[PDB]
PDB file of C-alpha atoms in Angstrom:
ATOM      1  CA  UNK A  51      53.431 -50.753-160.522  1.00  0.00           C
ATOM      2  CA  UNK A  52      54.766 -53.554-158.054  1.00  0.00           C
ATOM      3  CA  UNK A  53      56.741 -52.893-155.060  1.00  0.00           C
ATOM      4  CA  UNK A  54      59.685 -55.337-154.481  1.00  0.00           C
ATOM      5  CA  UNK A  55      61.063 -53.323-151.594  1.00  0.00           C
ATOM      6  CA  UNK A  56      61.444 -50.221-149.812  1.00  0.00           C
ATOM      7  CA  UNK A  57      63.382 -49.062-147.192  1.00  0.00           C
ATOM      8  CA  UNK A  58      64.912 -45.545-146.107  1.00  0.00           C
ATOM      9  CA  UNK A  59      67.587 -44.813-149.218  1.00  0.00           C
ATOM     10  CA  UNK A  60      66.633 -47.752-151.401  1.00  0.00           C
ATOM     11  CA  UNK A  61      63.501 -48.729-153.852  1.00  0.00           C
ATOM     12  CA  UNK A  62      62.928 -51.417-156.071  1.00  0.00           C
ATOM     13  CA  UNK A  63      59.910 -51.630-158.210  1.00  0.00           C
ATOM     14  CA  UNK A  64      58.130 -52.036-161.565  1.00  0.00           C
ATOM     15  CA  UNK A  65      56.803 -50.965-164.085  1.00  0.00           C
ATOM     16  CA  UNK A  66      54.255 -52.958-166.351  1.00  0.00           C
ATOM     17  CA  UNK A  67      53.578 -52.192-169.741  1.00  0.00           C
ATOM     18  CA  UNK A  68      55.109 -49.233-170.136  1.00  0.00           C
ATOM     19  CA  UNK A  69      57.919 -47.835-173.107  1.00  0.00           C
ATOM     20  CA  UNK A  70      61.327 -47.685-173.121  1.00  0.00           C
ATOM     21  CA  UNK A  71      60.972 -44.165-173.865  1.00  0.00           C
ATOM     22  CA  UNK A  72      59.461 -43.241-171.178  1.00  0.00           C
ATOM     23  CA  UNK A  73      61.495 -45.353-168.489  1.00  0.00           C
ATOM     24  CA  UNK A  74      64.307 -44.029-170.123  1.00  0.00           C
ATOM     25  CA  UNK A  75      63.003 -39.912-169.533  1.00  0.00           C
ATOM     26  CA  UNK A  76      61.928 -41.213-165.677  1.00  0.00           C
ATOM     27  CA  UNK A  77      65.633 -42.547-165.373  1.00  0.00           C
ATOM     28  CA  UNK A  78      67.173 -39.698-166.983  1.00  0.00           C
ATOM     29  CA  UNK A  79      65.081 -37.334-164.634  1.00  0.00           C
ATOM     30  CA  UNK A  80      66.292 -38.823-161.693  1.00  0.00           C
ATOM     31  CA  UNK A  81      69.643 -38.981-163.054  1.00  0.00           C
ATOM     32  CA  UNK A  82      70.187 -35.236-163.845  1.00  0.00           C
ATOM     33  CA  UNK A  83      66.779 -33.074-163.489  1.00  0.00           C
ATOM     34  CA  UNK A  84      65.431 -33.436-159.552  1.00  0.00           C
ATOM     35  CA  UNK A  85      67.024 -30.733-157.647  1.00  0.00           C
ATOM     36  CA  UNK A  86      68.639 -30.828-154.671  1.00  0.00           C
ATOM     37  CA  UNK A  87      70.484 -28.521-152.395  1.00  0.00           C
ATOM     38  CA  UNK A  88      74.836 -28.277-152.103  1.00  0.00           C
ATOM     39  CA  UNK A  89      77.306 -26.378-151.053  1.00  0.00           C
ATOM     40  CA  UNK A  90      78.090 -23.608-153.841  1.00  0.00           C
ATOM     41  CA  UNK A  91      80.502 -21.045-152.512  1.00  0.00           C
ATOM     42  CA  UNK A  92      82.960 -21.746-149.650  1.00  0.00           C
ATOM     43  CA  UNK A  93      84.349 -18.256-147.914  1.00  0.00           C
ATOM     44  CA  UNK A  94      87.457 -19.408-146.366  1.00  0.00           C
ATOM     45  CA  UNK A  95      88.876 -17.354-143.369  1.00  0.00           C
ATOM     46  CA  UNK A  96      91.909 -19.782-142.537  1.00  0.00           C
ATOM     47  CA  UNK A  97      92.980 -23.258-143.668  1.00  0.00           C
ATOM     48  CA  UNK A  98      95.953 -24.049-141.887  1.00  0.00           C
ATOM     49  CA  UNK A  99      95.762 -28.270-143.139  1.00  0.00           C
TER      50      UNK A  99
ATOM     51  CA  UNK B 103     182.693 -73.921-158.588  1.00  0.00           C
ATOM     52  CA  UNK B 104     183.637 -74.302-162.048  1.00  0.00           C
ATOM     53  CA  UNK B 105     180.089 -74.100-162.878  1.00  0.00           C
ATOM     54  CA  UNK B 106     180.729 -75.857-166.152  1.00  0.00           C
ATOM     55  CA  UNK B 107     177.594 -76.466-168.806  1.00  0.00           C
ATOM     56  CA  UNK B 108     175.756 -79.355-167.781  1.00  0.00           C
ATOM     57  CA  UNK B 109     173.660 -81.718-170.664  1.00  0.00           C
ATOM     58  CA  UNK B 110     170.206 -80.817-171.944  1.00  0.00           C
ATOM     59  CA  UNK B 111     167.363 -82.336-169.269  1.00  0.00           C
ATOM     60  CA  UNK B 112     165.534 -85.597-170.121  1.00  0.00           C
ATOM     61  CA  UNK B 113     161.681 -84.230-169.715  1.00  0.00           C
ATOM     62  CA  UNK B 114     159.695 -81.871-167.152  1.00  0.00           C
ATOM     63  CA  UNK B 115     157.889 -82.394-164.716  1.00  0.00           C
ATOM     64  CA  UNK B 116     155.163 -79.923-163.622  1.00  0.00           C
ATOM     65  CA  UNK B 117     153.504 -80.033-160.192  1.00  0.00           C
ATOM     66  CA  UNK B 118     150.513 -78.164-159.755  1.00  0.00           C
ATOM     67  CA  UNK B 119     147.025 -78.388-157.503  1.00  0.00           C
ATOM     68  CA  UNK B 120     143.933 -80.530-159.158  1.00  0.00           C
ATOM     69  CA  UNK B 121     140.367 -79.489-158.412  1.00  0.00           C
ATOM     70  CA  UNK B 122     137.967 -82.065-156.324  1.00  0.00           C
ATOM     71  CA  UNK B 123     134.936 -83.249-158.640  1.00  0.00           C
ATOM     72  CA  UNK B 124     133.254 -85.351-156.039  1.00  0.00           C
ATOM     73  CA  UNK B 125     130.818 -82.455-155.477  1.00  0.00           C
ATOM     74  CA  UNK B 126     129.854 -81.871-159.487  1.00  0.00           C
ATOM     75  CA  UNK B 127     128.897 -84.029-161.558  1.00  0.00           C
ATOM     76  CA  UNK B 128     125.795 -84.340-159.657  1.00  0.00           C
ATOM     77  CA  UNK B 129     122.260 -83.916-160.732  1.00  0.00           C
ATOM     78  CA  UNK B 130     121.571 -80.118-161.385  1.00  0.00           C
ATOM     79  CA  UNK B 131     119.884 -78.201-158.595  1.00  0.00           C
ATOM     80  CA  UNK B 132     117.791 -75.937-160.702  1.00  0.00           C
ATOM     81  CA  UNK B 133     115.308 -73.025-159.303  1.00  0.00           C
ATOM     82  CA  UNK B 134     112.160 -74.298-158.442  1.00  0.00           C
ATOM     83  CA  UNK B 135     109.639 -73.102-160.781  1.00  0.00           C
ATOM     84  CA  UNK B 136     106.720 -70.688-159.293  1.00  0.00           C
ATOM     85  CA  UNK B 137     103.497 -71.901-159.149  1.00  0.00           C
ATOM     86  CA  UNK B 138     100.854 -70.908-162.191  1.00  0.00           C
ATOM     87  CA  UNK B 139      98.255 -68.809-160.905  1.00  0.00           C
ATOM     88  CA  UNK B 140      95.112 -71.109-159.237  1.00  0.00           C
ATOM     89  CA  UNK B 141      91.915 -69.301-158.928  1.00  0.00           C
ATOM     90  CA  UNK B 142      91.028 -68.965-155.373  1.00  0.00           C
ATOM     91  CA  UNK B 143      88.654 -71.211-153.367  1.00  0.00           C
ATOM     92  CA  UNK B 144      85.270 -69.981-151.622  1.00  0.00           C
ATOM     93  CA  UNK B 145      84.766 -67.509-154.625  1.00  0.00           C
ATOM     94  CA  UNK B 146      81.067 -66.924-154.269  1.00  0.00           C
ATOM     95  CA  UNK B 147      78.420 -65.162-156.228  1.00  0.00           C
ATOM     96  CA  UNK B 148      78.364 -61.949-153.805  1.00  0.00           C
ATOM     97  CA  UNK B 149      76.260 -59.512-156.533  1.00  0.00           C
ATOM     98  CA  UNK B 150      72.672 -60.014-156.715  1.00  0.00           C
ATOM     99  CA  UNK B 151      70.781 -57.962-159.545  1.00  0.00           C
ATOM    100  CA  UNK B 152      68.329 -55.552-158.233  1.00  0.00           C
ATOM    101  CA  UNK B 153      64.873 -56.210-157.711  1.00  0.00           C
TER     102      UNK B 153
END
């Protein structure tokens, strides 16, 4: 793995001799499987805009 | 005041306004046709692939 750049919100790298299968299931996984945290349910008491 | 019939007339003559032709005639002042599109100057290469 080679490190082009990294700063706070961005990363650019490599990856060396490795399949397209896999690179594919890391993209996919940061795509649609890390979890994060958001706003589910919003209890309004007043919205007057 | 007889007011006999008088003989049949000789011709007619018929006075009426002509219209001035000075002004056409001329060459033809068309529309001026718009420009076809130019592609812009300074267009630059402004995306860079990552890494």
């Amino acid at each position: 793995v080679d490190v082009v750049h990294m700063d706070e919100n961005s990363l650019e790298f490599d990856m060396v001799g490795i399949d397209a299968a896999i690179a594919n299931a890391f993209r996919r996984i940061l795509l649609a499987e890390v979890p994060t945290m958001a706003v589910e349910k919003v209890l309004v008491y007043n919205n007057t805009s | 005041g007889g007011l006999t019939c008088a003989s049949a007339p000789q011709g007619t003559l018929r006075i009426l306004e002509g219209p001035q032709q000075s002004l056409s005639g001329s060459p033809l002042q068309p529309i001026p046709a718009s420009p076809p599109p130019q592609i812009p100057p300074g267009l630059r290469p402004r995306f860079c692939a990552f890494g």
